[PDB]
Design a protein around this ligand. Structure first.
Ligand SMILES: [Ca+2]
Ligand SMILES: [Ca+2]
Lengths: 122, 122
C-alpha cells in the first residue's frame, strides 16, 4: 500500500523522505502526466507503469509483506500479487537513493500545471 | 515552508496526515490543475491561491514562526510576509479538519491525468 511505500521511503531515504519524494516532478506520486523532469522523476514514472502492471490486487490500497533491516528493504510473503506491489515500491526507493545526487528542489511540489504536455507512454 | 506545513498537518490531523493530504484530488499539493473534486480539495485550491498572493518571500521554501499546543496551531513572529505564509498553511489545516467527514480515498493520490480539464482561476 502507499502507506507502506511511505514507510519504505522513510526507512531508506530518511524522515524527510516522504515529503521530499511524494510530490516531485511530473510523476512522483501517481497518475502523473507529461514528460519526466529528471532521473528521480523517471523513478516515479517507472513506478507508475509498475503499478499499471499489477492485476489481481490493488497497488494503492492492499498491504504487502516486507522487512526493513540495516538500511534496506526486502519484499517477502507468498502472495505473488502483493509481492509484485512491494517490488514496485522497493525498486522505486532504491532508484531514489541511486539518483539523490541530481535531486533538485526546483521539482519539489512542482505544479501539475508545469507538466501539461504530451505524456510519455508506458 | 512546506516542511512546516507537513508538521502542522501532522499535529492537527495525526501522523497519517501528511500522506493522506499532500496528494489528494486535483489541488492538494501545489500547482494543481482542473476542477476541485470536493470540499477537501477546495481547501488546497484556496491554499494554492493563498501562496499565489505571497509577495516578498517564498511560501514553499521560507521558514515561518508557529506554535503547536493542545491540538491547534497559532502563527506568530513579526515578519508579516512569513506570517502570511503561515496563515495559508494554518487555514488549510483547519479546513482539512472541518471537512474530514467527506474525505474520500477515491481522491487519494488521484492522478494529474484525472484533472485534465480547464482550471478554475484564482
Ligand atoms: Ca505518476
Ligand atoms: Ca494545487
Amino acid at each position: 500500500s502507499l502507506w507502506q511505500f511511505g514507510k519504505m521511503i522513510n526507512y531508506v531515504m530518511g524522515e524527510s523522505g516522504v515529503l521530499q519524494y511524494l510530490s516531485y516532478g511530473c510523476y512522483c506520486g501517481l497518475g502523473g502526466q507529461g514528460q519526466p523532469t529528471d532521473a528521480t522523476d523517471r523513478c516515479c514514472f517507472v513506478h507508475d507503469c509498475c503499478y499499471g502492471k499489477v492485476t489481481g490486487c490493488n497497488p494503492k490500497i492492499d498491504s504487502y509483506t516486507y522487512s526493513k533491516k540495516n538500511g534496506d528493504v526486502v519484499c517477502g510473503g507468498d502472495n505473488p500479487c502483493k509481492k509484485q506491489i512491494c517490488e514496485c515500491d522497493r525498486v522505486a526507493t532504491t532508484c531514489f537513493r541511486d539518483n539523490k545526487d541530481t535531486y533538485d528542489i526546483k521539482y519539489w511540489f512542482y505544479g501539475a500545471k508545469n507538466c501539461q504536455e504530451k505524456s510519455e507512454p508506458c
